[PDB]
Amino acid sequence: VKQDMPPVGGYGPIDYKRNLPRRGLSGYSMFAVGIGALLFGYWSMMRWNRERRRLQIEDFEARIALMP
């Protein structure tokens, strides 16, 4: 009998592919998302700014009527 170490029954395949799935989407979608979220933030910032303008005018009314 012989007791070397051959490949017992053959070994299966071994990959060597450059498998890069390319996660993400196209860049035009990235520009669309960026400009959309940016403009969303601009509109919300505009609304909050003019609300605080209203309250700032009310504080001006306080300092005007409080003075004499």
Add this chain to the structure above:
Amino acid sequence: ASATRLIQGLRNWASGRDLQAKLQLRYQEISKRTQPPPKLPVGPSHRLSNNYYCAR
């Protein structure tokens, strides 16, 4: 291994390569030691009556 499914999904989402499948922490196919003893075969000599050292 020895982890829950949430952080498993976070691993496979941070790198979409199915990291759970092959991970380079072997648990099962460590070669089982205390192997049986071998009997080494002898090649093109110990063939009696023809192994002439004048030849080879």
